[model samples]
Target: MKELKYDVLIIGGGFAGSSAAYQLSRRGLKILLVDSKPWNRIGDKPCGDAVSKAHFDKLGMPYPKGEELENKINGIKLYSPDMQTVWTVNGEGFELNAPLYNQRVLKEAQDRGVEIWDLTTAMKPIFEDGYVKGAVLFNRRTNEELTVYSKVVVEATGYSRSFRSKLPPELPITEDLDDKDADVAYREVLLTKEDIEDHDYLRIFIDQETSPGGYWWYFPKGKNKVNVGLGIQGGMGYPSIHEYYKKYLDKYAPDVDKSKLLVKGGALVPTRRPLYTMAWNGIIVIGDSGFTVNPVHGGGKGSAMISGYCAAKAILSAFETGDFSASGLWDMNICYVNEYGAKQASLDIFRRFLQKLSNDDINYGMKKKIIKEEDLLEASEKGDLHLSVADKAMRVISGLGRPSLLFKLKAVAESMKKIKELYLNYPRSPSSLGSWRREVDNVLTEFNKSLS
Candidate 1:
């Protein structure tokens, strides 16, 4: 076996790895990024193929354009079973040619002197004295194994969480992903036979039976082309999301040929809040591996990018201080959760609340205007649903039909506020992690109980 060393070794060349590489390389650090896919397929994971302008702005990067871009989306329009617009989330985004965008980022990093090796898969984190110092990798093309040492090992692998799964159990990473916390997704890109009039809108469909614990989405990629998919809650029934999608098309677009589907794939998305802690003893997990995604929608690209940027900042600081232990990387967790993870946690509470509601509840809430557009938009943006006396009075008049569901809504809203407040007070150092984790668990227990 051969051995090599770098300042940072990033495992997985997707959004997180490439973003981190780009950021780290700019600081003149020697970075090595390895991925199992060929260069052309680097970012071709099954996805909604969407990237929000807000996230790009958060990273201070321009929206991807030219060959790397696909569609310009105005915002998302959420609908009920009757196709009534329940909510129109105000945001701007783009549908990307993910592979091209990923390759572009990798190339940009390489241009800045980062080393990228495709078709190389990381086997496991190399641990020494209870600290992750590197990883062993296998190159499929050459059929060779190599040991790589680094000051930091980053797990950017998607929800399969390849490298994170190998870490010692004592770390904060959870081994068994609760089925309630995971999203099983099926998606496909199709060349539609008819024109989609609202090409700029991402339409989401919500109905419990059709998408239990999840929702179906129709995102237009370009003129007459759409990215269509459904996500179902994992760990329970094996309802065929594909069949539901087919039924949707048969009922809506009976004349369109099914053979025109361009791509079909499935993947597991971590739709929970970010991990309790993302760093331990020189190892950092970012992106889906750490569940840095929106719990309500399973959108991860932006969160992953922001997380990668945060990790890079922390890694650079650690390298400068010559301290790569858990304490050194502690700020990564603080910065992420405080900036975004808190909202994700708050939204996670809402996710639990949403999962418990029946389709009838949702329909009634939307139809009766109990869930107003402004209220839904504010909650989605800030992850808080604040109701004043005036708001309660309005709901009292409009939502009189569903008292039980409304009461549950209020309970979950308070729980969301409490959880977000707790996350805002996340432990400042590893010495306090245990107590903080206990507090988090207790809060989660109570929150789940409230839902039941």
Candidate 2:
């Protein structure tokens, strides 16, 4: 096997890997990025292409010109079974239509002296003495194997989580991602000129009876083209989201033609708050691999960008100090979670509680005007805020609503608050890893209890 050495080795050149590559290369580090395919087709996600105004501000990058998608999303309209229950917003977020953003990013990184090798698939994280040292990569194109020796390995491998399976058992990632936390999603992108031109609102359909713990979205990608998809929790054993989608179209879009369907695909999205520390020794998991996604809507672009920024920071830290081992990757988790993770935990807990609610309860709450737009939006701010859930629980109790709903809400709230507290008690650096591990374990144990 031919071997190469790099200052930083990044896996999966999607938003997280490409962004990290761009950022890390900007630091003048000798970096190598391995992606499975050309950017155009690699992560060609069947996506809503939704981003917020804030996400653009953080990236500080301008949208692409022409090619395909430069449209700004003008907010959304949430719908129930009947139009009577509707939540509307004016200008909600920004949209990126292409995974092709990586083409520009990866090319720029390569032009800036970062090595990029497409068709290189990372099989596992190469470790040394309980610390990640590098990875073994197989190049499908060349039919050859390659090894990268790096001080740091940055993982952006979407939800396949190619690296997590190789981590030490104590990381607890494997257990956390048991079948319950997964959602096998089937999505299709269909077009509707009337639907697109008629309403100026991105519509979301949420009927608990229809989508137990998940919802469906219909957002405009461009004129006459729309992204319509449904995601259901794995526990529900959702027969097939595509089949369900076909049913919707047949019932709803009587005149629609199948020939107009643009694209269709399926994937598994993690529906949980991310793990606290994605760094162990020399390797760091970013994006979906680390579960850095919003629990509510399965939004990951913003979180991926955020995690990419931190992963780059840690890689640079390792480069400057010449210490890419476990202890050196400390900044990856510290700077990010303290700034971002703490907030997401609270909202995730509320989301969990809502998950346990009955469809009848959800329909009733929607009808009774309890879970309003401002309330859900406020609770989801940076993924923290359970006060709203607590307040809702009190409302349910006083309103003499479902007793089980009240019980679940209270339990979920406690778990949310506990997760926040644990995040607050995050240790200063790698030195306190043992104590932090113990603390996190305690919180997870409590969180598990709250689930049932």
Candidate 3:
């Protein structure tokens, strides 16, 4: 029976919430950060433990977190089927990574004076006067109810779509939100001694078997361990990632050593367009809950950080305007989606196409260099997302009589182009949230059509 108030209240303590909390706290604001678990063990969700050192430097930081940093990435080693035809991409992979550096960042937020309420679970919202007043929180550990008030509440809950589902009837937002069929997953942290090395480059297996829609990876942590896992679409698969991985180990590497398994678990990755209506009165959604994740690389770090930063900016702006409605938080959508979401959506659409590709096709493409490094770098840039990797590959293999190249990259290029178009045409709130969403749907539908 205790009550607390903050200028802003953030739910979930993963990377996304921590990022926003850190940004908001440093700006001299009172933000109550809430999570269900203990403060000591925060957002270190299991990961392949791969991140670009360049990205760290870009964030104006030294390491991803504190002294407990796991690894310094340098490059990635991509293995084709049968472990032949290997491809290497340097300066983007790392060795010796941590699983819970996300927690370290949360500690950084607390160190910066952000008030955190660990063991606090936000059960539902406090809606009144057509606005979210705050949340009715619970101390799950103590079975006690607590009330927390804030001008803005952000949901960073991990794939829990409950926030959108719990929307009040009068404000039924996200009805048309395109939820992907299900979730993708990664079974990471199961390492063996033979697979471990101090300077081992991070590995990405681009075979359809390991990852039907995405990819599989192994990143070294020390001289004797590696984060090994694969991610694939849930809607189209057999024997789940875990089941497949287990069967693989049982069949091929049965003697790889069972004692080396470390923190092996399943993590659900969302594959959907970024959720709209992030702001509902005083409420907002961030992180996986809002699909604020890169659908291609499954890289939530950049997107989460970016969303947190922009969400904080929106919170600050709302405070200045004395309005926490959707209109006040409109900047969050514009800043994040336009700046990165459009590019991300284009990539997601292309990824969808790639996911549908046959294993033989992926193998053939990789063997032929259908998608080189330049194709990837440019595909992410503005105005170029619409170019087909296949077309570019066709040009590369034109003399060799390879026309299938164009057919492959065509959808990727088209989707990228379309996503940008929709982003540029985002409709204003209070006047066009619905219209803007419709426009985005139209573009995405067209993107899907081009795949055929």
Candidate 4:
């Protein structure tokens, strides 16, 4: 077996791994990125392909344009189950040509001296002295096997989580996902015969009967193109997500030719708060492996990039200190949890609440404006609900006919606030992680039980 070495080895060249490689390169580090796909297919993954512009601004990266930009988005239109009520929350975003954007980032990383091994799969992690040393790689084209050793290994393998799943179970990083916390999603991109109206705004339809614990989305990528799909919560014994997608597609766009399908695929998505810990000795978990996706909407691209950036920064610090252990890489957890994970944790609570609501309840809430656009915007943005006394009173009168829904909303708000606080106070070091995780589990478990 051929043997090689590097300062860092990143497995899976999707959004997370590619972003990490780009950020870590040009920083005087020997970095190797391995992807199972061939060079052209590196960033091609099934996705809704919508991302907020704030993410690009925060990272100081140029916004998507030219081939990478499919369409400009002004906001979102959320429809109640009955479709009789709609709430518009204005925000700037984009519909990306996902593969093009991903390839652009990967190309930048390569230009900065990051080595890429396309059509290569990481077989498993190499462990030494209770830490991940590197990985065994398999080259598809040459059918060659080799061992590459590195001081730090990053798992950005998305929902498959191939590397992190093989890690020693005793490590602090989470390696497993609950079925209830994931979504089986299917989507397709198609060119419609007729031009789509309201192409500037992404549209979301929340109907439990049609989607059951999930929702269907119709996002216009251009005047005649649309990215349409739906996700069904795993472990619910529901029919396949593809079946739901087809039913909705036929209902909404029956006149469109099926032969015009541009892209179609399905994959599992982690829809929950981030892992209890994303760092351990010699290993870092980012992207879907870290569950950085938003539970409420299952959108992960923005947060995945953020996690990659945080991991790159932490790894650089670890190299500077020459300590790749959990202690040395602990800052990744702190930065990510404070910056985004806390909000996700809070949204997890809200997700559970939304999943439990009946169509009647959703229609009534929307019609009465019990959950106003401002309230939705605040909760989605800050993970907090701050209703003034007068606002609460007005809601009380409006929600009087359905007192039960009002009570449930209040409970959900309290739980979301509590979970966000707990995540914000995440342990400062690995030593206290056990106790903190227990507290989080207890709170979440207790809250979930109330919904049951």
Top-scoring candidate (TM-score): 4
Off by over 4 Å in 1: 252-256, 389-394, 397-399
lDDT of 4: 0.87
Q: Clash number for model 4?
A: 0
Model 3: residues with Cα > 4 Å off, grouped in runs: 65-67, 92-100, 169-182, 195-200, 250-256, 380-390, 396-408
Clashes of each: 0, 7, 17, 0
lDDT of 1 by residue, 1-452 (tens): 89998989999888988888888887868899999999989999999989888889887965798988899999888887666645777778899999999899999999999999999999977888888889999999899999999988888988888887877876775444787798899888888887887789898888777778888888888888888888988877666767777676554334344789899899999878788888888788898888888999888998889889889988998988999998998888988997689999999888887887777767766677675677777777678778562256355545466455445666677788888999999999998989987887898899888765
Q: Could you tell me how far off, in angstroms, the CA of residue 350 lies in candidate 3 after the best superposition?
A: 0.8
Model 4: CA > 4 A from native: 387-394, 402-406
Off by over 4 Å in 2: 68-70, 81-83, 167-176, 193-200, 250-256, 386-393, 401-411, 430-452
lDDT of 3 by residue, 345-367 (tens): 66676667767766666566667
In angstroms, the error of model 3 at 365 is 1.9
lDDT to native, each model: 0.83, 0.70, 0.68, 0.87
- Residues 168-226, candidate 2, lDDT per residue (tens digit)? 67753433565656566666666664545533456677755555677777666666666
Colliding residue pairs in candidate 2? 51-94, 75-92, 281-325, 281-326, 343-383, 343-384, 344-383
| Candidate 3, residue 293: how far the Cα is off, in Å | 1.6
Better of 1 and 4 by TM-score: 4
RMSD of every prediction:
1.9, 2.9, 3.1, 1.7
TM-score of each: 0.95, 0.89, 0.89, 0.96
